[PDB]
Curated annotation (Swiss-Prot):
It is found in: Host cytoplasm. The gene is tubR. A DNA-binding protein that is part of the type III partition system presumably used to ensure correct segregation of this bacteriophage. Binds to tubC (centromere-like site) DNA upstream of its own gene in a sequence-specific fashion (consensus TTGAC); binds to multiple sites in the tubC region, probably spreading from an initial site. Upon binding to tubC forms flexible loops over about 1 kb of DNA that forms 2 rings, covering tubC and the promoter region. This probably shuts off transcription of the operon. DNA is both bent and untwisted by TubR. Monomer; probably dimerizes when bound to DNA. Binds to TubZ when associated with tubC DNA. Keywords: DNA-binding, Host cytoplasm, Plasmid partition. One of its GO terms (molecular function) is DNA binding. Its main location: host cell. This is DNA-binding protein TubR. It comes from Clostridium botulinum C phage (Clostridium botulinum C bacteriophage). GO terms for biological process: plasmid partitioning. This bacteriophage also exists as a circular plasmid prophage in its host.
Length: 81
């Protein structure tokens, strides 16, 4: 019942990195350093995590999009605190 390490790795970085709130949206290139996995793999895992409801999107107004983590994802993190 523990979450798989390879894809959930993204959702582990912010668990201990405190990037866990709707107001703040994380960028792919900041995640690409801390997550130890390249910019394609983090774009693909975030595309899956929309279907899990863990992650949610922001708009582009000149600057590119960004994605915040929902309270529904933090509840999974409390299970493995």
């Amino acid at each position: 019942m523990a979450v798989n390490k390879n894809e959930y790795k993204i959702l582990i970085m912010l668990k201990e990195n405190q990037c866990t709130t709707e107001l703040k949206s994380f960028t792919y290139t900041k995640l690409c350093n801390i997550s130890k996995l390249s910019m394609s793999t983090v774009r693909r895992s975030i595309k899956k995590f929309l279907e899990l409801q863990y992650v949610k999107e922001g708009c582009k107004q000149g600057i590119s999009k960004t994605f915040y983590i929902t309270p529904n994802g933090i509840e999974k993190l409390k299970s493995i605190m």
